[PDB]
Structure 1
């Protein structure tokens, strides 16, 4: 059988940029909450398949108890646990499309990422409201107001606007000028600018280093779900 197939099989071990980014960011986001429950996940495509840490995540971020988990390794107990996590998200206003317990238990990557995004959106971004603007659009207007003074920043979206890292440094500088010497930063060191903001955010604001920096700089259009997840932590930290 052909060498050509074998080489392309190996090539499937590279995740597309959008997955790398969502994987890194949504894993760190889940972990910055699960640590209040004394646990962590390591691999987002594997560690929600039994429904247990998913139910716990939902409890930690909602503050409300979910019904008791099924105990037992049998596959229908994992299905019952994930159904409880998804029924709880539904009950909180999220209309789920193309997402079901069966594919989550089977490790479906796009579906598992999509589910976690619906959680991040509902419990971190949905209720953001600035000047009669809610959710994604409200978080964006917020970023625009905070960064308006900064002439080397133009927040117009949750992707390309954020590539050079200056948008992140400005959000910090506006709220905490003591923490950053903004005037010394420029557009030629985007990787530096990103890792700097993330290092400052981690040390002083308790926000883990969620972003895939290399991919943000090098990908034509960064993943906006990942960037919204990270920026949503700055909003909660500053408001």
Structure 2
């Protein structure tokens, strides 16, 4: 089954490398855009995956871009408090007619790379600065 091993080699090296190229460069590009809008408030992002995981700073992002008052974040160190905090921002995005699917609070809290990057990309594309 050496040709099966060759195809496993192909899908292990080439596909994953070509995905990781775009992933790393797009994350580095999105970090500057989020830090530019987060610079007006005393906030900064060092890692895009880890910092969006409490959900408070996503609420800060939506409040800065919309310029309109979001519901007050719930204080708490538990996982469920982070889930509800992310759910607030997701609900605000949903009621602003921005379309998201396969997006949950636990997806952001679990730090899935593709879904976090897709959320940031959708915020860049469809949301109005105004």
Superposed CA RMSD: 1.9
Kindly report which structure 2 residues correspond to 1:48-197, keeping only aligned pairs within 5 A, or say none.
48-123=52-127
TM-score, scaled relative to structure 2: 0.81
Higher RCO (CA-CA < 8 Å; seq separation 6+):
2
Residue number among 31, 35, 53 corresponding to 1:31 in the alignment:
35
Query: What's the offset of the Cα at 1:124?
Result: 5.2
How many pairs does the alignment contain? 114
- Which of structures 1 and 2 has the bigger CA Rg? 1
**Per residue, is there more helix in 1 or in 2?**
2
In structure 1, C-alpha distance between the alignment counterparts of 2:73 and 2:119, rounded to whole Å: 19
Does the Cα contact within 8 Å between 2:55 and 2:86 map onto a contact in 1? yes
TM-score, scaled relative to structure 1: 0.45
Runs of at least 4 residues of structure 1 off by over 6 A? Answer: none
- Show structure 2 runs of 5+ residues with no match: 1-11
Query: What's the offset of the Cα at 1:39?
Result: 0.8
In structure 2, C-alpha distance between the alignment counterparts of 1:30 and 1:124, rounded to whole Å: 15
Does the Cα contact within 8 Å between 2:75 and 2:81 map onto a contact in 1? yes
Query: What's the offset of the Cα at 1:99?
Result: 1.0
In structure 2, C-alpha distance between the alignment counterparts of 1:22 and 1:100, rounded to whole Å: 22
In structure 2, C-alpha distance between the alignment counterparts of 1:124 and 1:19, rounded to whole Å: 25
Distance 1:19 1:107, change over 3 A: same
- Show structure 1 runs of 5+ residues with no match: 1-7, 128-239
Instruction: Give the equivalent residue in structure 2 for 1:146.
Output: none
What is the DSSP-based 3-state SS (H/G/I as helix, E as strand, rest coil) of the residue aligned with 1:68? Answer: coil
